[PDB]
Structure 1
Amino acid sequence: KSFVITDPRLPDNPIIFASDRFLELTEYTREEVLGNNCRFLQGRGTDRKAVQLIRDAVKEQRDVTVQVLNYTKGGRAFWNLFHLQVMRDENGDVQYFIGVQQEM
């Protein structure tokens, strides 16, 4: 499956881990994605109401399954059934965010 692990304890919640399937789907390279926020997958046609949800979840720290339109590195648009999981790996506190992308 395609997914990335982001570390919210860092500035701008950057991708610290990206599964190979992710790199395949998005056509980017690991040297390019590591350390950057995932918003780079959004484009001109990406509904902002959809991104407002994903934004609410990350802040309110909840899970969300949102269908949003993203773009590969080449410029090809594709639908992304996006699923956000909160690695509360701690004892209360949030340690990581797990994002799973499914090209629908």
Structure 2
Amino acid sequence: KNFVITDPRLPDNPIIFASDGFLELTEYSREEILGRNARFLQGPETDQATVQKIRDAIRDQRETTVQLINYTKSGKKFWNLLHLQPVRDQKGELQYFYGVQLDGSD
């Protein structure tokens, strides 16, 4: 449903692709998010310990699944169940990350 792809070879690992679901979940337009790092979803209640775990997973290029507070464009809080996965080229060099977002609201 909700997924993004980023390009870690570009500065600050920007989003280069986002699904319609992600746009609807976050209330941003495709135009507003392309070329930005996904961290703009974080806000006042976001646990920095979880952010650090993500940062570490990215550095190590390992898949990870975490739960963290994110915010829509209007500032609406939601729990984001976030899955991250690296993808590498045939020479083995990191090429993309993808992320799948689930809203944990009931």
TM-score by length of 1: 0.97
Question: Which residue of structure 2 aligns with residue 35 of structure 1?
Answer: 35
Question: Which residue of structure 2 aligns with residue 16 of structure 1?
Answer: 16
Task: Establish whether residue 87 from structure 1 lines up as the match of residue 87 from structure 2.
Answer: yes
- CA RMSD in angstroms comes to 0.7
Alignment of 1:41-52 (within 5 A): 41-52=41-52
Structure 1 residue 89 displacement after superposition = 3.3
Q: Any idea what the Cα deviations from partners look like across 1:38-94, whole Å, max 9, x if unmatched?
A: 000000100000000100011111100000100000110000010001112333111
CA distance in 2, matches of 1:65, 1:47: 15
Counterpart secondary structure, 2:40: helix
Question: Which residue of structure 2 aligns with residue 4 of structure 1?
Answer: 4
Question: Which 4+ stretches in 1 moved above 6 angstroms?
Answer: none
Task: Establish whether residue 76 from structure 1 lines up as the match of residue 55 from structure 2.
Answer: no
Identical counterparts, % of pairs? 68
CA distance in 2, matches of 1:90, 1:20: 29
Structure 1 unmatched ranges of 5 or more: none
CA distance in 1, matches of 2:6, 2:90: 15
Structure 2 unmatched ranges of 5 or more: none
